[PDB]
Amino acid sequence: ENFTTNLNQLARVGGIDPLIGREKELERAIQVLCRRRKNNPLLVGESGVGKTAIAEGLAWRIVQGDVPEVMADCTIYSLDIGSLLAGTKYRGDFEKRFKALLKQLEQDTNSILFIDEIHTIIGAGAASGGQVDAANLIKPLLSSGKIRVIGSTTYQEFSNIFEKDRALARRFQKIDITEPSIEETVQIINGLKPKYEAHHDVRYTAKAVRAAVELAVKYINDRHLPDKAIDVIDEAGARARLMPVSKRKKTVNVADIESVVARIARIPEKSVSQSDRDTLKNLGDRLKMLVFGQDKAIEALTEAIKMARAGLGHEHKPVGSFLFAGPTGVGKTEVTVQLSKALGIELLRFDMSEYMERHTVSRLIGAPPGYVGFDQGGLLTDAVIKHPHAVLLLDEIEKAHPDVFNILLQVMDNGTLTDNNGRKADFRNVVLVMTTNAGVRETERKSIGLIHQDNSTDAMEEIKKIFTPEFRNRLDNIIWFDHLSTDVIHQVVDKFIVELQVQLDQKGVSLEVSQEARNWLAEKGYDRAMGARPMARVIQDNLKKPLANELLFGSLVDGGQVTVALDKEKNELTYGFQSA
Amino acid sequence: EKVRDALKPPS
Ligand SMILES: Nc1ncnc2c1ncn2[C@@H]1O[C@H](COP(=O)(O)OP(=O)(O)OP(O)(O)=S)[C@@H](O)[C@H]1O
Ligand SMILES: Nc1ncnc2c1ncn2[C@@H]1O[C@H](COP(=O)(O)OP(=O)(O)OP(O)(O)=S)[C@@H](O)[C@H]1O
Ligand SMILES: [Mg+2]
Ligand SMILES: [Mg+2]
């Protein structure tokens, strides 16, 4: 009938891809096909392993004749459950169709029914009245054993649906199918290759198949090995096929497959381009013009990035894990924010002051216990999944509950944080930076003595008290931030003034500041303990406040050409406004 | 609690 599909006929015309390997799996199924009791086999394994292909592959082998003589003539049919229910509008239509099919099979005694997703029949034909389920109709024949059927299910299934009804499970013989080894996968791809080569009119290199399996399992962790490798191979041919010329590349070579894996895994590709090569080269100076001082922190951040792109990087850890500690007003956070801008990647920020309670930490990995809503996603895992190449900033990590550290421990050591739903987040390309203010009180503390002692070591001890040895062992570097020097402050003043000029440019105002005035601001605003934040306040009172009055009501409403100069006699600035 | 129902006419 139309519902049934003779797989053997399909193979005869090339409609089923050939099977490679899995001889033990076929032998276990064939041994079960011929056993007196529990004749029905069940193919159970994870998605994308080959369970469906094995059932179709069996028919392919039969037509070829490389099967046991007992199974020399065994027709394998495929049930289309959708077609069974297509016209079952009137009462008894489902039974007539299903019973007509079973009668056909028992008469032959050679025909075998392959039913994919066997768990689906557990509720078919349950409209109303008789409520004759499809499993109920098949159960009598299966118990006797006159009819042989083949099933397929996932590990998710076979526990929640099929195993509920012991009547069906007892008859079926479970078979465990596991993904093949890396070496086995290369053999499989080589066997399927001629069909993919013809479709795309390209020749895959021997090394390319090894790279596809090795690269995909290494970076593509959301799928199983057989389909995962085949996906890369299928896409690689299409990429070459769509070149502007009819066929720019008639064959696929190593380092071409890498491009496909990069798009699928959203990881930076190897063979770095001149555009990104120059960016990494200038990533040490571009940051030094925005963040002054703390050169040791910039080098640690850029070297870890350069290493990963070069190919020398941790196998399972992230690109780099750093802890930024030190006094206030120093560029602990700013350097992280500017890093993401210099690299052109998404910045993931997480103010850890909002994760003090234990339940808050859970939100990162998953929703609350038994959350009624469907949005059971995690905040940390989703962000990393959405942006695998990013800067994972965790400011004020000290405030966060200790549980957060236990989460980062597996991240720094394994690079993957599985979520409640089973999705695996990849941290291999996400920079992990954590800023802490632990021991900041010691930095500003003044000793009881003529000389003010350093107190930096005391602050480090406090840091060690909170961050256990395990956490500090997995950190690539614990960069301490030195206090801002006078020379640095002068550079910082230019930065804030430039920002002021940008705000003024939006109002058609141009500001010129004499060098003498800049030093006056630096001297007045320089505070070693408080860093650079006071400088911003000094700019507000001296520069922004007079300008604000003029901008709102004065010569600078629609004008500009402001000229500031400091008179030495009164050590006070002189604001000159031109109406323009 | 809300579940769809599929009916069948007698003939
Ligand atoms: N010789 C082979 N060995 C292993 N896997 C293969 C082989 N040939 C093809 N495959 C893969 O197996 C796929 C067929 O589907 P399966 O891997 O059996 O999973 P499935 O039955 O679709 O899984 P569900 O939906 O979870 S029941 C093909 O599209 C390939 O990805
Ligand atoms: N090295 C620096 N060069 C230029 N501006 C800086 C520097 N360090 C800090 N700033 C400025 O100071 C302000 C705050 O800098 P951040 O790095 O965000 O401070 P922070 O390290 O988070 O502070 P705490 O007190 O330690 S939480 C911003 O205006 C920054 O631009
Ligand atoms: Mg399948
Ligand atoms: Mg900070």
Side-chain angles (χ1 to χ4, degrees):
Chain A
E1 307 90 335
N2 66 273
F3 320 108
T4 182
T5 294
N6 196 333
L7 295 180
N8 299 66
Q9 178 55 27
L10 187 62
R12 280 170 179 178
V13 290
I16 283 155
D17 305 333
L19 191 61
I20 296 97
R22 300 293 203 168
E23 284 77 35
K24 298 289 172 188
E25 280 73 341
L26 297 152
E27 288 165 10
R28 281 294 321 292
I30 289 162
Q31 277 185 12
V32 170
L33 290 196
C34 296
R35 70 172 282 189
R36 194 176 144 278
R37 288 282 162 278
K38 280 175 173 265
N39 196 301
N40 313 122
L42 188 70
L43 274 62
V44 184
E46 292 288 359
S47 56
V49 296
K51 59 180 83 94
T52 296
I54 288 156
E56 306 191 340
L58 184 63
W60 174 80
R61 296 173 96 80
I62 288 155
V63 54
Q64 291 286 354
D66 56 71
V67 305
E69 290 82 2
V70 66
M71 212 74 72
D73 306 71
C74 176
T75 302
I76 299 149
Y77 290 98
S78 190
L79 190 81
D80 196 342
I81 190 67
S83 304
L84 272 298
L85 279 69
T88 46
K89 166 168 174 173
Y90 306 90
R91 182 171 81 89
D93 291 2
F94 185 82
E95 300 179 11
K96 282 193 294 184
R97 290 177 169 198
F98 198 62
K99 287 207 181 189
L101 174 53
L102 301 187
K103 289 287 191 180
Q104 165 164 3
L105 267 68
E106 69 184 24
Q107 208 288 326
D108 203 329
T109 313
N110 296 324
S111 299
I112 175 158
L113 179 135
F114 161 62
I115 169 158
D116 188 69
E117 285 206 327
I118 182 73
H119 53 259
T120 55
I121 54 147
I122 278 156
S128 44
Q131 295 282 99
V132 194
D133 186 67
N136 293 28
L137 294 153
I138 207 177
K139 269 157 60 170
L141 311 198
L142 283 180
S143 303
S144 305
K146 63 184 81 184
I147 190 169
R148 303 179 289 178
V149 312
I150 294 157
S152 79
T153 60
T154 61
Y155 284 131
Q156 174 65 352
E157 285 95 331
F158 187 70
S159 305
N160 304 270
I161 293 152
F162 189 77
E163 260 287 359
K164 299 291 183 176
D165 186 7
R166 306 308 317 285
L168 278 168
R170 85 195 303 286
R171 308 300 175 189
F172 279 97
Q173 183 63 40
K174 201 217 308 204
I175 296 162
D176 273 309
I177 293 158
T178 60
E179 55 172 1
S181 87
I182 294 92
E183 299 295 330
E184 281 170 347
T185 318
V186 175
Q187 298 294 74
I188 294 158
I189 294 165
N190 273 266
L192 306 169
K193 176 166 78 75
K195 283 191 173 294
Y196 289 72
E197 289 188 355
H199 191 290
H200 299 337
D201 195 0
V202 301
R203 185 179 177 281
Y204 295 109
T205 44
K207 293 172 67 58
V209 291
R210 291 208 68 78
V213 181
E214 292 174 359
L215 292 167
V217 70
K218 188 182 166 188
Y219 297 105
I220 296 157
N221 55 52
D222 71 330
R223 294 181 179 192
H224 301 78
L225 204 62
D227 64 315
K228 168 165 63 181
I230 294 162
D231 292 1
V232 179
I233 297 286
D234 202 312
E235 195 182 348
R239 182 170 153 283
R241 168 173 165 193
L242 289 149
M243 291 290 285
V245 311
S246 45
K247 192 158 64 172
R248 200 79 160 280
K249 272 190 70 162
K250 181 162 64 173
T251 183
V252 180
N253 299 84
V254 72
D256 197 70
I257 298 286
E258 299 184 344
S259 308
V260 178
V261 173
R263 305 297 301 288
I264 298 157
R266 313 180 63 198
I267 65 185
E269 58 266 29
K270 316 192 202 172
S271 87
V272 188
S273 57
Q274 291 179 350
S275 179
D276 214 326
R277 266 197 163 93
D278 61 50
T279 293
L280 264 50
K281 201 166 185 294
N282 315 132
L283 184 57
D285 297 65
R286 286 223 307 287
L287 285 173
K288 282 168 195 169
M289 53 165 61
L290 300 158
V291 177
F292 313 109
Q294 314 305 335
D295 299 326
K296 295 177 70 58
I298 287 155
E299 296 290 351
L301 281 165
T302 57
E303 287 289 336
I305 287 158
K306 286 173 195 189
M307 267 170 54
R309 303 303 307 270
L312 309 171
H314 306 311
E315 206 286 327
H316 48 62
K317 311 174 68 173
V319 301
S321 308
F322 310 99
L323 185 71
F324 289 0
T328 67
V330 189
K332 292 182 276 178
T333 302
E334 196 66 13
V335 73
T336 315
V337 173
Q338 297 298 326
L339 182 69
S340 72
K341 298 185 191 292
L343 293 159
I345 66 192
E346 199 70 37
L347 163 61
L348 306 176
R349 193 158 180 165
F350 278 103
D351 301 326
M352 309 313 296
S353 303
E354 304 162 8
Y355 297 97
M356 298 161 161
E357 290 287 0
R358 203 205 306 284
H359 67 93
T360 46
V361 182
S362 77
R363 292 271 200 168
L364 303 167
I365 56 161
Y371 178 51
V372 180
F374 79 105
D375 190 307
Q376 292 189 8
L379 282 168
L380 197 88
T381 64
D382 286 2
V384 169
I385 290 158
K386 290 182 287 191
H387 310 283
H389 194 206
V391 180
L392 178 53
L393 170 57
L394 318 172
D395 195 356
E396 311 301 305
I397 194 70
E398 180 261 308
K399 314 309 191 304
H401 198 256
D403 290 12
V404 168
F405 300 117
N406 305 124
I407 281 163
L408 303 160
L409 281 174
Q410 53 179 123
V411 167
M412 293 198 280
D413 215 41
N414 310 122
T416 52
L417 186 73
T418 317
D419 75 326
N420 58 353
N421 298 3
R423 301 210 306 165
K424 279 167 63 173
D426 208 58
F427 292 75
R428 259 179 283 182
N429 313 124
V430 74
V431 174
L432 176 54
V433 170
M434 299 171 279
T435 83
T436 192
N437 284 284
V440 68
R441 278 214 170 78
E442 300 293 344
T443 65
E444 59 157 30
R445 181 169 61 74
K446 297 195 186 68
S447 65
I448 290 155
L450 305 168
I451 294 283
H452 294 339
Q453 59 209 42
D454 193 359
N455 292 318
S456 63
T457 64
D458 289 324
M460 291 298 307
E461 294 294 345
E462 190 172 346
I463 282 152
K464 290 187 274 186
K465 288 203 310 197
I466 293 156
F467 301 92
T468 62
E470 302 89 6
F471 185 85
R472 301 192 281 94
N473 280 306
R474 294 156 166 74
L475 291 173
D476 291 16
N477 286 316
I478 291 147
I479 295 284
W480 178 257
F481 280 66
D482 60 72
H483 293 245
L484 301 179
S485 175
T486 55
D487 301 330
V488 166
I489 291 282
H490 294 295
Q491 307 181 237
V492 169
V493 170
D494 188 13
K495 196 194 176 177
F496 293 145
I497 289 162
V498 167
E499 293 169 357
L500 178 58
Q501 288 172 355
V502 169
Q503 295 170 345
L504 288 168
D505 288 3
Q506 290 270 310
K507 298 280 153 187
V509 176
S510 67
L511 170 64
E512 190 276 337
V513 181
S514 61
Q515 211 74 45
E516 204 73 5
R518 303 202 177 199
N519 302 336
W520 191 79
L521 302 162
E523 195 71 5
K524 187 166 179 63
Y526 167 57
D527 196 351
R528 212 167 170 275
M530 304 299 171
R533 269 185 216 277
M535 294 305 317
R537 310 196 263 269
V538 173
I539 298 284
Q540 287 168 57
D541 297 5
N542 288 262
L543 311 185
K544 299 186 169 182
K545 201 199 300 314
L547 292 167
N549 283 277
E550 286 286 327
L551 283 170
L552 291 158
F553 47 99
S555 297
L556 307 181
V557 170
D558 305 325
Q561 314 307 132
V562 178
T563 306
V564 180
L566 177 135
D567 69 320
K568 272 79 166 182
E569 50 261 31
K570 296 187 286 298
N571 64 89
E572 284 166 12
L573 309 173
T574 70
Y575 321 107
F577 314 104
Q578 176 57 22
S579 61
Chain B
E1 195 279 348
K2 298 202 318 202
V3 68
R4 291 159 190 271
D5 173 61
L7 78 167
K8 59 189 192 302
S11 188

